[PDB]
Paper text:
Among the nine mammalian CLC homologs, CLC-2 is uniquely activated by hyperpolarization, rather than depolarization, of the plasma membrane. The TM region of CLC-2 displays a typical CLC family symmetric homodimeric structure, with each subunit containing an independent Cl− pathway. All eukaryotic CLCs contain a pair of ‘cystathionine β-synthase’ (CBS) domains in their intracellular C-terminal domain (CTD).
The orientation of the CTD in the AK-42-bound structure is the same as observed in the apo structure that shows N-terminal hairpin binding; the density for the J-K helix is weaker than in the apo dataset, but still sufficient to allow modeling of the helix.
Residue numbers in the entry:
A (entry chain A), B (entry chain B): 567 to 644, 783 to 841
Write the structure that this text describes.
């Protein structure tokens, strides 16, 4: 784990290594946006946004409740996550941030992943894999 | 101090100790209401919002930036908060949180103030005065 070693990584900041692609989902009717997200992406989590070009984020959504929403459209009958749940407004990270803060947002304190952010903006999602990758290089 | 022994910090939550009138400001062009935020409440850092009908916590501004913006707008001559220094809501709170969780995010980061958000729409504000009261009452 981080810190002690030859000194060079004391320099590095979150923008220098964070992955730029976007598991976002729009606050709109289209199950096609959901289908495309579920096709293109995998793992625990997605982000919910006001619109693709405004890029304000509300919170996080996970594969089971969205494939169950698709399941609700699939049900024998003839998008609104607020009918069930939408999860906590998480931490965020600002582009300049040094690793020695970011380590103490996921540890000594329990959180799994973080959205990198700017004023009203979503830049991407960080995970422990990028983090421990960045610690080691 | 943290409290070792007989406590009800596990009984009671951020929703109980909440305070709700706040120095918030719209993204709007007019300065006629910015005049209120100068004295209608007392405090250092304000709550910038995406709309008086949405109240997403876009970020925070110190009085010395906004008073200088008014000093320029009423300079001897015959909106633009956008190019002052701004910071997004650095951490945010949700009603079901017990006092102990809050104490750790305050103390571990040296953050002086925080906002309650639920998902998006603000509910109220917190400072070192509220907790240093409520941990004894």
């Amino acid at each position: 784990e981080l810190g002690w070693g030859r000194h060079q990584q004391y320099r590095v900041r979150v923008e220098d290594i964070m992955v730029r692609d976007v598991p976002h989902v729009a606050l709109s009717c289209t199950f096609r946006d959901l289908r495309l997200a579920l096709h293109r992406t995998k793992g625990r989590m997605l982000a919910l946004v006001e619109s693709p070009e405004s890029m304000i984020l509300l919170g996080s959504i996970e594969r089971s409740q969205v494939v169950a929403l698709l399941g609700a459209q699939l049900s024998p009958a003839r998008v609104n996550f607020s009918d069930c749940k939408i999860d906590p407004a998480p931490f965020q990270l600002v582009e300049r941030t040094s690793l020695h803060k970011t380590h103490t947002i996921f540890s000594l304190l329990g959180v799994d992943h973080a959205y990198v952010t700017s004023i009203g903006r979503l830049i991407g999602i960080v995970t422990l894999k990028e983090l421990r990758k960045a610690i080691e290089g």
